[PDB]
Design an enzyme around this catalytic site. Sequence first.
Site, short mmCIF file in Angstrom:
data_model
loop_
_atom_site.label_atom_id
_atom_site.label_comp_id
_atom_site.label_asym_id
_atom_site.label_seq_id
_atom_site.Cartn_x
_atom_site.Cartn_y
_atom_site.Cartn_z
N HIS A 398 84.01 94.76 8.91
CA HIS A 398 83.13 94.37 7.96
C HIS A 398 82.89 95.19 6.56
CE1 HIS A 398 79.04 92.95 5.94
NE2 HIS A 398 79.05 94.01 5.59
N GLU A 399 82.80 96.88 6.90
CA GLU A 399 82.91 97.66 5.73
C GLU A 399 84.13 97.79 4.91
OE1 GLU A 399 79.08 98.29 7.08
OE2 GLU A 399 80.00 98.92 5.08
N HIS A 402 84.30 95.55 2.31
CA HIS A 402 83.73 96.22 1.09
C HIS A 402 84.82 97.01 0.31
CE1 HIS A 402 79.77 94.79 1.52
NE2 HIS A 402 79.30 95.59 2.72
N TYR A 440 73.33 86.40 7.57
CA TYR A 440 73.51 87.50 6.78
C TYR A 440 73.96 87.70 5.69
CZ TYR A 440 73.53 92.57 5.27
OH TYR A 440 73.50 93.84 4.67
N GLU A 447 78.20 90.96 0.28
CA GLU A 447 77.98 90.82 1.61
C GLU A 447 78.65 89.81 2.18
OE1 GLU A 447 76.07 93.37 3.62
OE2 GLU A 447 76.61 94.39 1.79
#
Length: 488
Positions: A398-399, A402, A440, A447
């Site tokens: 997930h990061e 980013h 989320y 996100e």
Amino acid sequence: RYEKWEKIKQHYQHWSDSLSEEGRGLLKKLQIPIEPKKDDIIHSLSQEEKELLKRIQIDSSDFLSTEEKEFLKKLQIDILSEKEKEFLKKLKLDIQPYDINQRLQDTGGLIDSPSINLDVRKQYKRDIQNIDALLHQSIGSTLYNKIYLYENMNINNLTATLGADLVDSTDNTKINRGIFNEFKKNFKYSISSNYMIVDINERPALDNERLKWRIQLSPDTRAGYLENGKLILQRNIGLEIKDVQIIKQSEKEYIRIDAKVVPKSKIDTKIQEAQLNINQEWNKALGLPKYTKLITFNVHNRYASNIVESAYLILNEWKNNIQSDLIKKVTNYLVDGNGRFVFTDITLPNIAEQYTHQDEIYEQVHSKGLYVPESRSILLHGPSKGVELRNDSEGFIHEFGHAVDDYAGYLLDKNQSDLVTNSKKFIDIFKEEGSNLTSYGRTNEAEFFAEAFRLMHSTDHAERLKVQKNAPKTFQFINDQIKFIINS
Ligand SMILES: [Zn+2]
């Protein structure tokens, strides 16, 4: 039971009797944090602010801690929501108890970290220094090997991920033996960065404490007697895990953790040795300079060794589940900007890669993981569990998601450095498919991109394909960006 208690109390009797009323008071402050008077706070808000309170969707928020969400709903009756959001961030700082031991743990001992209000940060510092000075007497080279000290701990203090399932739902008085073996798999050493408060006599477990530490002091370990059979240990000590077993106590099951006290430095070296090694190995795999510093171990707390070993798996899972070229390109971009992979057990506002780019404490964030564009780093916090994440390995992806966003917009304009999720193409994509993935994912463009990226690299391939169906425009947009990056 009472012999060894009496023998310790005596040894420390001169010490006890010598305690100032001010020092005796300090040790109480330490054991019992000064919570906020529920009334003292509500009498700070304005009439406008009082309104926004009693009527906000509270018990179900993003940042609201359980201890926080409760203490707070405890006040809405003394009378989401996006403009109540920036309001909350500010309110979260004004109701934390004054908890020295917590302060040390959150910061890993780095009490100077600009993560709370300066004058409060100084109060903590004055107190911590006073206590250090109070705790000047060794256990001595006579008692240390003839006594055991005990601690009871909640499994979630060490890993929230693995503690959710450490007890069988099948039988709640027995321990799942698989989770045991991987709890104990790589549990070789520990670090207390606060003051351990331990029992002279093993104490029966209370509601959610299935870990029963049995500890052996060293002759040099400094400690102080606390009334009712306890010792307070000097902070900054290391523990070597000597045996982790399942024992039975009154027909329920517990974990016996046997530990010996050793110099914190012995462990710090071990961590330093590991941090070197993992960069060695991954510099080779990414074709980066032998000596590049990419991976940081920021480790200061009780499940120390696991943070380290965990990082290896997390990084393995990353290479297995993501094209080699995408990885190599993006990491080279992060290192181009002096970035870092940071694995840690202190909270994230106390990581320099975050705090030096966010001066306002109300905008500093703690959570399972983070990407900081300004320092090009991934922060991963071991001990906690992110909502809707299977394992720590998933949260990382997930990061990196980013950072993939980051490189993609740098490559659109090397001058106008920006996030691709801020280009109107993807912004529009978001208002359609923005609600089709994880709950989320609906938070914002960035996100949504990250979570989509994440799912698109699950080991569970059902999940990978569920993205193509429910958000095909998002799906293509991402794989595009990928193809884009691999081509320099
Ligand atoms: Zn995120």
